Amino acid sequence: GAKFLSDAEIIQLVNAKHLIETHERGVSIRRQLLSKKLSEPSSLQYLPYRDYNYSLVMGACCENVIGYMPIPVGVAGPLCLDEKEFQVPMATTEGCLVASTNRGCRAIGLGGGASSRVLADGMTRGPVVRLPRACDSAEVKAWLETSEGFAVIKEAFDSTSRFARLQKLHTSIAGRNLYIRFQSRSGDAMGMNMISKGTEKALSKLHEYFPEMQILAVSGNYCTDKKPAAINWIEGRGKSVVCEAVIPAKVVREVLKTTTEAMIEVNINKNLVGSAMAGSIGGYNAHAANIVTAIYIACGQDAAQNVGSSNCITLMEASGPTNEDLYISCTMPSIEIGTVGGGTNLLPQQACLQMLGVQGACKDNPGENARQLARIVCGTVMAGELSLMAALAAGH
Amino acid sequence: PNEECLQILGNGAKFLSDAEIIQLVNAKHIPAYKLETLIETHERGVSIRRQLLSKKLSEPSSLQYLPYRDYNYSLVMGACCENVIGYMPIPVGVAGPLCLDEKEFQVPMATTEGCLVASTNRGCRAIGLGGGASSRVLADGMTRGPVVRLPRACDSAEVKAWLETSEGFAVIKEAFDSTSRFARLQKLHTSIAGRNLYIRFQSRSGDAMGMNMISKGTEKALSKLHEYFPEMQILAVSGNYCTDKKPAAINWIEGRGKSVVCEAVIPAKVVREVLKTTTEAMIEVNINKNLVGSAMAGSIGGYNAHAANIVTAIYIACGQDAAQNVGSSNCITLMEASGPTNEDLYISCTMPSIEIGTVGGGTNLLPQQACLQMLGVQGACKDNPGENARQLARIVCGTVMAGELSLMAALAAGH
Amino acid sequence: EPRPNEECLQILGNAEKGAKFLSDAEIIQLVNAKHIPAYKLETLIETHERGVSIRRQLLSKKLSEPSSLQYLPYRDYNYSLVMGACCENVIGYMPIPVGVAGPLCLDEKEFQVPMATTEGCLVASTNRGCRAIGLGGGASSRVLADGMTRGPVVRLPRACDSAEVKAWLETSEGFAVIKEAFDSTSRFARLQKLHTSIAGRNLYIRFQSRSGDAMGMNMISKGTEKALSKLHEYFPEMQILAVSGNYCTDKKPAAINWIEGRGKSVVCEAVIPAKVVREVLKTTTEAMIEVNINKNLVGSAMAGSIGGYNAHAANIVTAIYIACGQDAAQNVGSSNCITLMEASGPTNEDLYISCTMPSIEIGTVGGGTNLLPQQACLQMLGVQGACKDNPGENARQLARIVCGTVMAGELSLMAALAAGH
Amino acid sequence: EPRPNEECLQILGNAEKGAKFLSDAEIIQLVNAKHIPAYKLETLIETHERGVSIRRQLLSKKLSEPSSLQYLPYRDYNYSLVMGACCENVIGYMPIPVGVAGPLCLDEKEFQVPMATTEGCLVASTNRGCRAIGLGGGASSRVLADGMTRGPVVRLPRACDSAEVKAWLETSEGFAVIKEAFDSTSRFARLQKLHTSIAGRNLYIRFQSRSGDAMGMNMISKGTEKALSKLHEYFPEMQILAVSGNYCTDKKPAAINWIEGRGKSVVCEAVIPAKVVREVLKTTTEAMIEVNINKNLVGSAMAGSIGGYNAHAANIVTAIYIACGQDAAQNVGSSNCITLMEASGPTNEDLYISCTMPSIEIGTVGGGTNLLPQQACLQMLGVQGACKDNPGENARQLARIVCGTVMAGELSLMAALAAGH
Ligand SMILES: CC(C)c1c(S(=O)(=O)Nc2ccc(C(N)=O)cc2)c(-c2ccc(F)cc2)c(-c2ccc(F)cc2)n1CC[C@@H](O)C[C@@H](O)CC(=O)O
Ligand SMILES: CC(C)c1c(S(=O)(=O)Nc2ccc(C(N)=O)cc2)c(-c2ccc(F)cc2)c(-c2ccc(F)cc2)n1CC[C@@H](O)C[C@@H](O)CC(=O)O
Numbered sequence A: 001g002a003k004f005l006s007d008a009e010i011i012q013l014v015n016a017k018h019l020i021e022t023h024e025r026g027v028s029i030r031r032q033l034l035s036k037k038l039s040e041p042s043s044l045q046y047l048p049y050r051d052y053n054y055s056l057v058m059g060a061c062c063e064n065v066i067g068y069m070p071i072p073v074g075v076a077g078p079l080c081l082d083e084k085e086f087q088v089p090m091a092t093t094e095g096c097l098v099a100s101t102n103r104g105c106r107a108i109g110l111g112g113g114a115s116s117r118v119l120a121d122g123m124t125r126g127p128v129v130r131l132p133r134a135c136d137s138a139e140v141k142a143w144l145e146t147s148e149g150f151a152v153i154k155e156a157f158d159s160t161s162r163f164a165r166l167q168k169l170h171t172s173i174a175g176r177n178l179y180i181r182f183q184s185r186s187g188d189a190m191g192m193n194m195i196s197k198g199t200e201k202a203l204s205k206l207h208e209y210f211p212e213m214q215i216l217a218v219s220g221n222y223c224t225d226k227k228p229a230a231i232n233w234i235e236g237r238g239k240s241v242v243c244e245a246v247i248p249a250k251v252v253r254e255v256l257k258t259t260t261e262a263m264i265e266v267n268i269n270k271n272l273v274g275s276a277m278a279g280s281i282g283g284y285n286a287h288a289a290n291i292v293t294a295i296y297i298a299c300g301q302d303a304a305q306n307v308g309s310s311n312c313i314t315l316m317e318a319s320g321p322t323n324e325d326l327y328i329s330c331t332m333p334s335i336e337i338g339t340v341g342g343g344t345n346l347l348p349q350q351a352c353l354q355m356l357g358v359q360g361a362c363k364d365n366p367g368e369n370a371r372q373l374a375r376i377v378c379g380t381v382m383a384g385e386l387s388l389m390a391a392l393a394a395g396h
Numbered sequence B: 001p002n003e004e005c006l007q008i009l010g011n012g013a014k015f016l017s018d019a020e021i022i023q024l025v026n027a028k029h030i031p032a033y034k035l036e037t038l039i040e041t042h043e044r045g046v047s048i049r050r051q052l053l054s055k056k057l058s059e060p061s062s063l064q065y066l067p068y069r070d071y072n073y074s075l076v077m078g079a080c081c082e083n084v085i086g087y088m089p090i091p092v093g094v095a096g097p098l099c100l101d102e103k104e105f106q107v108p109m110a111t112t113e114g115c116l117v118a119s120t121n122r123g124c125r126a127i128g129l130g131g132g133a134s135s136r137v138l139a140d141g142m143t144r145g146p147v148v149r150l151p152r153a154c155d156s157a158e159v160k161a162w163l164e165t166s167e168g169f170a171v172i173k174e175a176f177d178s179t180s181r182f183a184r185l186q187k188l189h190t191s192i193a194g195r196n197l198y199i200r201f202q203s204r205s206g207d208a209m210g211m212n213m214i215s216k217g218t219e220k221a222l223s224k225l226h227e228y229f230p231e232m233q234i235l236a237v238s239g240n241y242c243t244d245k246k247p248a249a250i251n252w253i254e255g256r257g258k259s260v261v262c263e264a265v266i267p268a269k270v271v272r273e274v275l276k277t278t279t280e281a282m283i284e285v286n287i288n289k290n291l292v293g294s295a296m297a298g299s300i301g302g303y304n305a306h307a308a309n310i311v312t313a314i315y316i317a318c319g320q321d322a323a324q325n326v327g328s329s330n331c332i333t334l335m336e337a338s339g340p341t342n343e344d345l346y347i348s349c350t351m352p353s354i355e356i357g358t359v360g361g362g363t364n365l366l367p368q369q370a371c372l373q374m375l376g377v378q379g380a381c382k383d384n385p386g387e388n389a390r391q392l393a394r395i396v397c398g399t400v401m402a403g404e405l406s407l408m409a410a411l412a413a414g415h
Numbered sequence C, D: 001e002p003r004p005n006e007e008c009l010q011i012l013g014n015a016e017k018g019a020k021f022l023s024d025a026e027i028i029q030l031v032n033a034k035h036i037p038a039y040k041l042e043t044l045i046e047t048h049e050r051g052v053s054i055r056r057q058l059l060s061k062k063l064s065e066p067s068s069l070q071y072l073p074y075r076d077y078n079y080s081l082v083m084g085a086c087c088e089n090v091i092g093y094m095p096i097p098v099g100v101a102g103p104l105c106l107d108e109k110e111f112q113v114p115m116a117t118t119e120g121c122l123v124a125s126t127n128r129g130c131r132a133i134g135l136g137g138g139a140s141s142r143v144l145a146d147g148m149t150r151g152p153v154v155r156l157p158r159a160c161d162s163a164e165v166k167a168w169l170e171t172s173e174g175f176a177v178i179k180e181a182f183d184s185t186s187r188f189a190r191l192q193k194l195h196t197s198i199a200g201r202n203l204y205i206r207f208q209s210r211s212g213d214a215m216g217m218n219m220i221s222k223g224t225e226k227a228l229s230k231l232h233e234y235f236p237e238m239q240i241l242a243v244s245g246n247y248c249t250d251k252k253p254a255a256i257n258w259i260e261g262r263g264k265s266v267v268c269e270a271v272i273p274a275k276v277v278r279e280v281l282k283t284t285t286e287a288m289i290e291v292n293i294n295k296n297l298v299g300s301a302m303a304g305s306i307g308g309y310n311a312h313a314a315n316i317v318t319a320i321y322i323a324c325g326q327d328a329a330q331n332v333g334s335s336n337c338i339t340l341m342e343a344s345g346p347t348n349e350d351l352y353i354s355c356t357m358p359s360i361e362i363g364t365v366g367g368g369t370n371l372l373p374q375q376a377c378l379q380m381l382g383v384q385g386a387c388k389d390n391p392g393e394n395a396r397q398l399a400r401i402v403c404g405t406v407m408a409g410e411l412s413l414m415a416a417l418a419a420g421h
């Protein structure tokens, strides 16, 4: 069929208001079609496309594909975290970011490593529904807060998927609007599609108890996904994580080129007081977003979720016998992450997840790989904070 | 032989083999950090670093499918990335044409979320069938917000009053502007918190995003301030008052980088046929999702559906700092009735802090430049400095609006 | 005339005599040059009003205008209920005018709502909004949640230890132990779901419970202190850093109050016929909706507001609070409100309106509600004091009336801005 | 003796008789028989107190307990300065106990600060903070900015047009034309650089200007209306949607007040020697810094606060505001405060403290400051009325006192939380 025709002939068919056997050739024909629309048709020539595995992308990750975009990958490590060592991949185009993070890892190792805990775990979706009156929506809130009501909604939610196990609901009324925050774990997936599916069946079960309920939108911005929101900061979303380390005064002096006292002064007055004066919600850190974004791109995460995933408070205190050692912690309540699905289905992204030993599903304990990646992100963010803050204090 | 290989390094490394250099590191004849300068070519440096790293992994075959061959590392080395072990391919799709200010754009989008490019593309189609979109740049100026301390709050108050005078500001403006061609300091904004003083330097940067340039002007400006106030301590060149890569109301209210607005009217027929909904249904969902819903969630600047998706995809494709998506995604999406019988859809997005550039950083790499060239905005604009970066910002805000139209229509339609 | 300090001290020390056997001038002598500090005037002097008078005379000599206090009243006020309970170093009182806005038609009842204010037109404006609601068939409200909070911060030696305490508090058995300790301190102490947050080795714990008709801060703090003492038995290394760590959050703006609620969360609503909107409010439904979206939603958004999606709910909350003996400083969070307006009815021309106020901090027992004048304003609404057969009902009713009067005030001010002066 | 309705009305309409020649019961008989509307009472009745008296009697019959107003006082209060200026439908007045905390040692002066509250121990606590400041060598404050705002919303046909008006307002000649219009409305009107923001075809314009010693909403709104009238000449398609689009922002929480300021921006400071922290405040500098960081910075941060980085600034602000005739609803934003605490001296045992309050909304002329008891409390501080030779100094001085009393409050409460108990 299509293999017998030439390139010029197939394009003659597309323009004349009228499939291909190989994926790479389809990408080439789309480049040639697109070339005819651009003022500089030669602009595509250094946008690569050859010898990429497009089979895992089509009908899954991207449409109208004209190639790919190489992002340089560097390694910050070893990062000593919970008695293990990690070579952390970081996809960035910002010079010195990997080298800065790498120095932070070095300081943590010489202080006996970092320790981390996951505090909560559950992806969310926050639909908006409407009832005729605010009194009716008040009735639905009261019903959802009974043990009986939650149990039928939990049963509906949990019937849609293996890992769909519903946790406590959170709700808000705004007049006759009702926002309902469904939270659940999702194995090792980030869990978006899984929770929306459970939400749809849970909402249709709610509709049987309340036939006059309109489902306005499956997302009413109460999740909250990919926008800044105090609800992710206060309630969490995905993995809530804490990480810490104590850096000996010697190691702060020799590696970090500053003092424990000077680090505390900059952290308080930049990360707390400065972020406060700027009107920040959840942005009490130096540059967590650099690290999160770099790891996310390299590891097949949804990079748009750095909006909320970068939420972080970095604290720095005096520590030890002479009060000269630096205690550091980062607390990140809303790390949105996964080791299956999305961009983690592609081979290059999996290579970076394999480096960290978290690629794919953890079969013995569903969800444990994604949990480990969240811990790795929090630890690497703390390395980034340690290093950049030291540079800022030393005052270059 | 080990000491035979060291004698060849005295002449070179190019003559040796992979296993011999790795033998020289494992036995401690030579430390690993010296391999940067010794090996001549960049691609072989990446290869050795991969082999050395792989033995330390618990699964030594992890890097098999991470590509590294036949990529331009010369532009990346010493300017974009360190400890390089390869590159990460992110698929690029195209949404267009986007009909924006009498021009048509094919918008590159680096993403791995299925149906994002297709959804965005449908929004473009609805905009085009509704007579195009229009956009305006409202403000332009990258910021840096250092923190200084004085001995007392009374002294810091004195410095604030001095910076607010005509003569004080002029002396600070001259030191700032002496560092670069495009360095042109606009009115300072300051906040005191006790003996702390946070100073927000704002300025255009031509077509660069402008982080490095504003920081050079900031350091020289603070140096002149030090002569007028010797007791002043420069605590940190960034005091989170900029604010860069963290959510902050100051970016939402004062702006950062390019502030941009965009708009269009979608005819009622186009809303039914292309978007599978009505104007009345779109409006109801926008009010209660993007305003009231974001309000109930405690949002500052997150009055949109998924601006972040579009901002992030364009940013990766176009060599932007993708971490700046945090602030650059700030967006309010408004929808309302238009036309004779209130049946057409007026839509607008306003994005006050798009941080962006067409020169410097990742826009110096050729693949990223190709996507910039697709849009006709690659590199500097000699005649009108800053016009390429202003145009990309308008493209981002317009593409975001296309994305808001499409997703909001799907949410209003249900199922 | 005033005899020396020695004779003045012996007469004060004598039980048969006391401060009654001294002149004003002699008491001012023993203060000027120690022996009596100033705060001891409370317990020592014969009557409360004389103690106030003496304090005023002392104060007037320190001032640069000695006649400053001339028009600050103090005589004949009932200071018995104020000393040792509501105020110290008392030098008089401040009269705040009290107007009435009503009848407010709320839940098939009517309410004459007291409002203490000095802003001109506020009471008449709110009264106009009440009339519009009345001609629209009345307003309906519901209490959505109920629980005053307190948000202490503790510290463990490590964040891993603070993480251990968070997880233990989340087990059913762990919460049960802490709930038992909390609930034993008072008959109204009934601990609800706990919310916690970690910041490194800090752990913020939000204790929440109903509190009868009292606003309930004293009671929650006493329950909180016993709960933390018990938590220390299981975690001896835990340090209580502060009984409030600003996680409550009390008297400061905070997203947590907006999202979780504090005290009473309340929604109120009403449909105003298109006829009434024209005649009474001098505007149209179409115009009110447009002003509400673009002022109270879009405008507040551009201003970077958390919970301030309203026109002037703080005016009504503050006025009712001062009149009804509430803690007026809690206006900060109690004014949190989102006002929504949309089309309604067959024509699509009638104005639907709702106010949602997640964090009304309110009580009809304790504090300023012990004073008789502000008890009079509470009695107007039928919510004075405790409700025996149904504890908490007077405080719940007062929260409904606040949210209903706010909606009336929103109706009226929004109509005025819509019509153009 | 009570006459028929028709006879009572001929006396009412008789110009040389009126209501004076009728009894209370006759006027009430006329009201219940629908001959005089209840609102017409104000103008018909000769004496203000008698109007209040009769309004109270009417109100009482409607209440479910007729004696509920017995303890709400009304007699012998100066309603002349309240009717048609500060309050309507007036049924009396609400006395708030006034206490005094001082001396507050501020800028080498001493202040006796009046505090109207019903919360036990607030005045004593605040007074202890004053003592620590006085023995600590005093506090120093500075006014960093000054200018009340109004933030109207206007609408252009398209977003492109609103961008056109925005860029027009930013040119020096366009701004100069609007500034002459604004400044022409009052002698204090001095329009500062305009701050604007676009949301689609909306345009929020933030007019700022000093206002003498008045708080200044009447003045700023009057200047704003003439300003937008001039703007409409240049842009006739522009629609003034509301004179307030919540971009001011008045009486709602908003990041814009925190960042740009509104009213008086003020910083206050002091160094408390270790000895004084020990003997007055019963604690150490180290314990206080640890509580301050983890409560007022970190705790407020975890709660998601905008501008609420303090312990109880709102307590002090509210008490002073009620006592001094301010708009107490403006404590929502006026209470905005960040409290910082540092180690000072050779061994880190002295306590540097500062409070920064960017948006104190205050005034010594107009509003409740026209009333005489309120004026007495202003006279205590030497800030009553207008300053002749230096306009705005009295309002500025009151804002520095408010920030210093807040700092005293912060000192005391934080010491108590650092102790235990
Ligand atoms: C890339 C690393 C991560 C980096 C560093 S660094 O790695 O430590 N040091 C340098 C120094 C010079 C270069 C160069 N050749 O231009 C590169 C790296 C610094 C920095 C630190 C202390 C200094 F004295 C000077 C520079 C800065 C940096 C921070 C705030 C500035 F104002 C200005 C530069 N950044 C970027 C952080 C950036 O992406 C988020 C910040 O904007 C977040 C914030 O702190 O607000
Ligand atoms: C990818 C596009 C952009 C997309 C779409 S879409 O383009 O319109 N349609 C589809 C349908 C099916 C697939 C598939 N095969 O998985 C992919 C796209 C939808 C959507 C909308 C209405 C619907 F009835 C069904 C699906 C959703 C979507 C939104 C909220 C949900 F709860 C659940 C799915 N998303 C993701 C948006 C996501 O990245 C930000 C949102 O989380 C932001 C927000 O609205 O809060």
Ligand SMILES: CC(C)c1c(S(=O)(=O)Nc2ccc(C(N)=O)cc2)c(-c2ccc(F)cc2)c(-c2ccc(F)cc2)n1CC[C@@H](O)C[C@@H](O)CC(=O)O
Pocket (backbone or CB within 6 Å): C119, C120, C121, C122, C125, C311, C312, C315, C412, C413, C416, C417, C418, C419, C420, C421, D150, D218, D221, D243, D244, D245, D246, D248, D249, D250, D251
């Ligand atoms: C007191 C009432 C409550 C009041 C009113 S009112 O009830 O409608 N009428 C009058 C009539 C005459 C006087 C007088 N001075 O003699 C005072 C009020 C108005 C107002 C509003 C729109 C108009 F077209 C005309 C007047 C305003 C008011 C609002 C925004 C202004 F810019 C300017 C005046 N206010 C104050 C509201 C104030 O306490 C919170 C608002 O500032 C909150 C906000 O909307 O941002």
Ligand SMILES: CC(C)c1c(S(=O)(=O)Nc2ccc(C(N)=O)cc2)c(-c2ccc(F)cc2)c(-c2ccc(F)cc2)n1CC[C@@H](O)C[C@@H](O)CC(=O)O
Pocket (backbone or CB within 6 Å): C150, C221, C243, C244, C245, C246, C248, C249, C250, C251, D119, D120, D121, D122, D125, D311, D312, D315, D412, D413, D416, D417, D419, D420, D421
């Ligand atoms: C009124 C004063 C100002 C007051 C004080 S106080 O004046 O210093 N001490 C008092 C007060 C009263 C009595 C009494 N008779 O029972 C006894 C001692 C205290 C307090 C502090 C440390 C303590 F060990 C005991 C009490 C508290 C207080 C704060 C947070 C608590 F959790 C619990 C009590 N408050 C209330 C502050 C309140 O209006 C805003 C705070 O809630 C703001 C905040 O910190 O979040």
